């Protein structure tokens, strides 16, 4: 006639009174257990029990007057988890094995401290590889939580945070509220989360549902992984009696599509246990076990501790079997469980042993125990739709099986993002404008070279022979440069790739500096020979000087292009909202200018170069105003255009910087200028001789 | 005639916190010898402590509470255990026993009155650290503390009461850092502001790995003052447990720290309830103790002393002591409460009276002077009240105890009389010249004076010499000489009167080289048109962009730049020093061209194509320096004072009429 020990908090003030029903069922189970089946062949299991009342004082005088006292014990059963610490630390000194039907505390996961604490009730720390999963299955990976702080809720998100670490899931935010989270869910839309954890109890989940509609954190674009052990309607109890400013209305609505992720403790199959019925034959009888207690559970009023009475059945069925197979092994010669005293140490290892292999399906499931003495359960989600919860599947912690049931309403259709993905976008230069520009730029470069080609003349007539020709061949050439440089400034990222944009960019500064040298060391250069003759009053004094303009430019640009040259400075803009989509898309632009390190240094110097140029170009072509000479009858034209082409080089260089950033303007202006600047000045200098040429 | 008590000890061989236990229970035996030994104290009684070892285990102490509960004499109170852990639980176990515990030597900050009702602590918690830190902080002015604690509990509550407690001293937290392994990482957040006094709450080696990184990164001393909890053991700091700092390494930086510990022995002067001082129950002690030793030695004998106490007023109040005493029985505990609220007396470690549940026990304080420990004073609970003469003096690095805020003060700048008067009196000296050859050249109309360049130019360009010393003057001005008020129109004369030095001498010297180049192949006006192109755009200045000093006080080491306008510079000064530019490189470029030529009616060109190339060079150095070298105002003027002065002299000596015999 073995006995155990149970204690169950059936009659107290506060906590978890959980043996209202956890009595009873293990009563059921002690019937099952020694009157129908030949589970002991020859025994009758015994329990004598006492209330805790839900505190650790009373558990501990409720385990001295068991542990001393005339009919012998060889096991405990505990309820809450004080209890459950008070005894299962100190059993190992009467080397006892303490069952716990109902202690869901992280912290009796340690076997230093409980040596011989087996739990059939799993730990708050089950529902986080669940999460997780769900987490990795919806492609999420920016997640909230939302604690309460009790002891039991930090040691959950801890074990949430660590294994978050080993799936590339980043936790943005951590709050942490005592009794009222406003201060902690309104930060929750600061740093901006979509997918949020509650690691609180329900009367905390009341009030943090009310706290998210007029703070308006549901809809489309939340996700809420609320503890899945709340009552059916969690939402719609206890609404006056709080400081629940909201409506049952309201209450509802933002319920909606959040997920509940809980720990299975009833037979979700219509298999039959173990016990020789199933989990809704259990169920059945133990509602018709209770109403004889005085509880009115017909019409609800359920008694406290309804939902774990599955685990105390378990619990006394577990340790029926292990003594089963204890005393299946210890036939192995004379010591047998009658004659168990709290020194025998072999008897105790032996039902350790026994209780370590333990498999078997019972109401709540398949029972079995981790190596640390917790419940292997499996993990079941559900979520909640218009105020009702449809199960989407359940998970196998153990081994990875996710057994699926495609019932997730997702509102809009598609699984939420866990963040506002941005996109960056490269804004371009309109390809009509950079074609149409490509086009005149061509236009430009053949007329500019049918001019060079028609100066084959040069010695067949005196017109351009007493033009200093060479001269005006520089000016062609340079402008062919600086045109191909104006092509080249219209060619953005759009039609090159990024890591040989730099290539471009370079390229576009030194021809147009080279082209602009050499435009006008036959414009201005040749201006400067001129008045120097009318002074002083042929061919060298003009190439050695476009020569030296040419090395002092060229020394700059190449100083510039090795010492700091240009890689990449994209810009920004407002996040800019995208067409139609229905969906957190954020559209960014980014523009392609050109910087670098001392950018300023450089572009002040070039421009300074070339200002200094076109000052002296301008003054000189107005002492230049009528000294025609004969060998260079072209010096009143050249010279007409030097104010043209100054003018427009002192306005489009200042006003370029303050529309540089507008992308398509600012090259419709740099290509025009430019186009002018080389069509005036080749028209007044070579239409004339044309004209003159032929008539 | 036998009461028994029930005690709990951490003995027998190698269990952690073992010299807690075997160090006491000499002080228990003497206290029982003394107490049966005494009289009108307890008389028909003889305390026997009837006491099992709890190896450090909560099962263990569980077990030994249930045997002793369950057979043997009735124990009519509980000696508390040494170990949080081990007491803890036998603290919840008691309470439907109806039994009062006292401890001995469990400091844990959690002992509260309303968890444990019947846990009368006879030495003081951790919390009671508090108080004395707080105290030195009254001491030695020091109202800005941050705090580096360990993530334990223990260490925890106490940090947590501190901070809570020093926000009404108007002492203001900078840091609180809570490490967990890592101690330098910390430091370096606590470092990260310009924080010297730390209060830390920590382990010993903890404490010894804290003081490694002290070391690692700098915070020796001589600056960086420490505030830490010492319930450590003897020579903490000599064991070789932390990264790798040696003894004679980790002690650098515990040095001029201050540690807070239980005062082990009252130092006055009084006679205790057993009838003899302290010292000789310290002799008695260090007789019968052999090698074992403990800081709670006296504690322990003044637990078992006011357990006397209290067995002695329930035996007067309640006659049927040890003939009704019932463990079910609910009064008894109450009565024994009342026995444990009603003790005051004086034990060897000073007046014990239990005040919440706990003893305010005096607070032991020292500190590390010269590679030793040596005590400093003592902080009264009681009458609150920090005795610092007791002990050694407090010994600081250098003279002065740490500032709480490091001070560095800051001045403006541009001074030094010297640099300022030697440029005053050159300016002087150099108008005296501009006036003396205004005054060569007013005896005009005389042969070559009155054939040469035209005189009436030459008192323009004396004119704009004179004027640039006037602007090197006013330049040179700064805001500690003038009111502040009159910043802007100085800038302004910075500015305008610079201009004008410009206008009337650059341009005197352009009219006359615009001359020369009419001439290759009614007229001074154009110097005033030139002033034109500069007075227009100073009204600019005024009118729409008024000046707004910028102070920017930067790198202030071991002052504060005082700027002109903080308008649009790069957009108007650098348009100003462009046209500037654009008339030099002019000047100097028809110079070139016309250096030959002699063109009588206006003559000494060549000295005037002189002054313009030393003109064009003197102007684009100044401006170089002035762009680039503005560190301070005073580096400035002393480099371009002088440039100003020689490029002016030279122009006003080369082309006003050098000998001419
Ligand atoms: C699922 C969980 N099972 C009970 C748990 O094992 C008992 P426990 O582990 O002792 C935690 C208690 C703490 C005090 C208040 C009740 C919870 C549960 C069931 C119902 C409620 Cl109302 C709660 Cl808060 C927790």
């Not at chain 1, 009696?241 to 009833?266: F, K, N, S």
């Not at chain 1, 100054?646 to 370029?656: F, R």
């Not at chain 2, 500190?367 to 009240?385: A, D, N, R, T």
Request: glycine share 6%.
């Amino acid at each position: 006639e073995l006995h155990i020990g149970g204690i169950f908090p059936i009659a107290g003030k506060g906590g978890w009174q959980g043996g209202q029903a956890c009595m009873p069922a293990t009563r059921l189970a002690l019937d099952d257990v020694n009157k129908q089946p030949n589970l002991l062949p020859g025994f009758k299991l015994i329990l004598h029990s006492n209330d805790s009342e839900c505190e650790p004082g009373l558990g501990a005088s409720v385990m001295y007057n068991l542990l001393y006292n005339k009919p012998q014990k060889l096991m405990l059963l505990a309820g809450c988890s004080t209890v459950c610490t008070t005894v299962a630390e100190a059993a190992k000194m009467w080397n006892l094995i303490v069952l716990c039907y109902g202690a869901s505390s992280p912290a009796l996961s340690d076997r230093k401290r409980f040596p011989t604490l087996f739990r059939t009730h799993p730990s708050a720390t089950v529902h986080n590889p669940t999460r997780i999963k769900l987490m990795k299955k919806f492609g999420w990976s920016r997640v909230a939580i939302l604690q309460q702080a009790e002891e039991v809720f930090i040691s959950t998100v801890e074990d949430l945070e660590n294994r978050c670490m080993e799936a590339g899931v980043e936790i943005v935010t951590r709050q942490s509220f005592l009794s009222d989270p406003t201060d902690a869910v309104r930060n929750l839309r600061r740093q901006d989360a979509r997918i949020i954890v509650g690691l609180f109890y329900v009367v905390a989940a009341r009030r943090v549902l009310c706290e998210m509609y007029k703070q308006q954190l549901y809809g489309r674009a939340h996700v809420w992984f609320f503890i899945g052990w709340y009552e059916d309607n969690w939402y719609e109890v206890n609404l006056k009696a709080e400081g629940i400013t909201c409506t049952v209305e309201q209450m509802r609505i933002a319920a909606e599509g959040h997920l509940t992720t809980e720990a299975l403790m009833w037979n979700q199959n219509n298999q039959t246990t173990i016990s020789g019925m199933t989990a809704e034959e259990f169920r059945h009888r133990l509602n018709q076990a209770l109403i004889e207690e005085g509880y009115d559970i017909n019409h609800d009023r359920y008694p406290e501790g309804y939902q774990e009475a599955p685990l105390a059945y378990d619990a006394v069925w577990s340790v029926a079997l292990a003594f089963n197979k204890t005393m299946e092994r210890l036939t192995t010669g004379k010591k047998s469980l009658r004659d168990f005293t709290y020194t025998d140490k072999e008897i105790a290892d032996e039902i350790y042993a026994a209780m370590n292999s333990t498999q078997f399906l019972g109401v709540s499931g398949v029972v079995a125990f981790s190596s640390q003495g917790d419940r292997i359960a499996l993990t079941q989600i559900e979520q909640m739709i218009d105020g009702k919860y449809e199960k989407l599947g359940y998970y196998d912690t153990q081994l990875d099986n996710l057994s699926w049931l495609n019932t997730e309403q997702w509102i809009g259709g598609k699984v939420p993002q866990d963040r506002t993905i941005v996109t960056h976008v490269l804004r371009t230069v309109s390809l009509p404008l950079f074609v149409c520009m490509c086009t005149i730029s061509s236009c430009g470069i053949f007329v500019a070279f049918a001019l060079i080609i028609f100066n084959i003349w040069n010695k067949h007539r005196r017109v351009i022979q007493s033009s200093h020709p060479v001269c005006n061949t520089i000016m062609l050439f340079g402008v062919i440069i600086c045109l191909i440089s104006v092509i080249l400034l219209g060619i953005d990222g759009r039609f090159v790739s990024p890591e040989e944009y730099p290539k471009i960019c370079q390229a576009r500064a030194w021809l147009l500096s080279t082209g602009f040298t050499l435009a006008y060391g036959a414009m201005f250069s040749k201006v400067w020979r001129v008045h120097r003759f009318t002074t002083k009053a042929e061919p060298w004094k003009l190439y050695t000087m476009v020569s030296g303009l040419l090395s002092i430019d060229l020394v700059i640009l190449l100083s510039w292009q090795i010492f700091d040259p240009l890689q990449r400075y994209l810009e920004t803009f407002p996040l800019e909202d995208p067409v139609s989509t229905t969906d957190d898309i954020k559209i960014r632009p980014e523009l392609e200018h050109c910087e670098s390190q001392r950018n300023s240094m450089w572009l002040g110097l070039v421009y300074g170069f070339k200002g200094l140029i076109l000052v002296f170009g301008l003054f000189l072509a107005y002492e230049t105003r009528s000294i025609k000479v004969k060998q260079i009858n072209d010096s009143r034209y050249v010279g007409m255009s030097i104010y043209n082409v100054v003018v427009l080089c002192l306005i489009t260089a200042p006003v370029g910087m303050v529309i540089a950033s507008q992308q398509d303007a600012s090259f419709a202006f740099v290509a025009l200028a430019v186009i002018f600047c080389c069509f005036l000045s080749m028209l007044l200098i070579f239409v004339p001789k044309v004209i003159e040429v032929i008539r | 005639s036998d009461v028994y008590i029930a005690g709990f000890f951490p003995y027998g061989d190698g269990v952690e916190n073992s010299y807690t236990g075997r160090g006491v229970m000499p002080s228990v035996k003497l206290a029982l010898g003394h107490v049966n030994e005494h009289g009108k104290i307890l008389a028909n009684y003889r305390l026997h402590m009837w006491w099992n070892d709890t190896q450090c285990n909560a099962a263990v102490g569980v077990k030994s509470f249930f045997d002793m509960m369950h057979s043997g004499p009735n124990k009519v109170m509980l000696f508390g255990a040494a170990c949080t852990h081990v007491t803890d639980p036998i603290a919840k176990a008691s309470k439907h026993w109806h039994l009062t515990q006292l401890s001995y030597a469990d400091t844990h900050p959690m002992f509260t009155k309303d968890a444990f009702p019947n846990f009368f602590r006879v030495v003081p918690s951790e919390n009671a650290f508090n108080a004395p830190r707080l105290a030195l902080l009254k001491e030695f002015n020091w109202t800005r503390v941050g705090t580096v604690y360990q993530n334990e509990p223990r260490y925890s509550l106490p940090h947590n009461h501190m901070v809570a407690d020093l926000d009404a001293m108007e002492v203001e937290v900078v840091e609180t850092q809570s490490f967990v392994n890592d101690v330098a990482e910390s430091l370096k957040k606590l470092r990260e502001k310009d924080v010297r006094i730390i209060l830390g709450n920590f382990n010993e080696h903890f404490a010894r790995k804290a003081f490694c990184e002290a070391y690692k990164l700098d915070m020796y001393g001589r600056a960086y003052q420490w505030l830490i909890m010492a319930t450590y053991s003897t020579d903490w700091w000599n064991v070789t447990q932390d990264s790798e700092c040696s003894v004679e390494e980790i002690a650098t930086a515990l040095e001029g720290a201050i540690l807070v510990d239980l005062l082990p022995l009252s130092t006055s002067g009084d006679i205790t309830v057993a009838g003899i001082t302290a010292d000789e129950y310290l002799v008695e002690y260090d007789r019968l103790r052999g090698t074992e030793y403990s800081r709670f030695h006296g504690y322990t004998y003044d637990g078992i002393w006011a357990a006397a106490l209290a067995i002695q007023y329930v035996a007067e109040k309640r006659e049927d002591l040890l003939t009704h005493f019932d463990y079910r029985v609910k009064d008894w505990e109450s009565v024994f409460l009342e026995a444990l609220r009603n003790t005051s007396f004086e034990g060897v470690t000073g007046p014990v009276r239990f005040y919440n549940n706990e003893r305010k026990a005096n607070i032991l304080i020292n500190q590390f002077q010269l590679g030793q420990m040596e005590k400093i004073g003592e902080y009264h609970s009681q009458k609150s009240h920090l005795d610092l003469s007791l002990g050694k003096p407090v010994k600081w690095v250098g003279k002065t105890p740490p500032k709480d805020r490091t001070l560095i003060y800051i001045e403006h700048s541009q001074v030094n009389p010297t640099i300022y008067i030697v440029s005053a009196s050159a300016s002087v000296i150099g108008v005296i010249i501009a006036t003396v050859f205004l005054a060569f050249n007013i005896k005009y109309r005389n042969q070559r004076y009155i054939k040469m360049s035209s005189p009436h130019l030459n008192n323009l360009i004396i004119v704009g010499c004179m004027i640039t010393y006037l602007s090197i003057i006013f330049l040179g001005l700064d805001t500690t000489l003038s009111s502040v008020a009159a910043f802007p129109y100085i800038c302004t004369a910075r500015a305008w009167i610079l201009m004008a030095g410009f206008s009337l001498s650059f341009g005197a010297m352009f009219s006359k080289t615009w001359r020369v180049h009419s001439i290759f192949t009614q007229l001074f006006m154009v110097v005033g048109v030139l002033l034109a192109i500069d007075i227009a755009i100073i009204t600019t200045w005024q009118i729409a962009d008024p000046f707004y000093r910028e102070t920017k006080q930067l790198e202030p080491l071991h002052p504060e730049n005082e700027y002109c306008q903080s308008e649009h510079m790069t957009i108007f000064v650098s348009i100003i020093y462009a046209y500037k530019g654009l008339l030099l490189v002019f000047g100097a470029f028809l110079a070139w061209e016309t250096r030959h030529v002699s063109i009588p009616a206006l003559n000494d060109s060549k000295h005037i194509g002189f002054s313009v190339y030393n003109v064009f060079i003197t102007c684009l150095a100044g401006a170089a320096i002035s762009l680039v070298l503005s560190d301070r105002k005073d580096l400035v003027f002393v480099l371009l004072s002088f440039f100003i002065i020689f490029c002016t002299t030279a122009t006003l000596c080369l082309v006003f009429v050098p000998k001419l015999v």
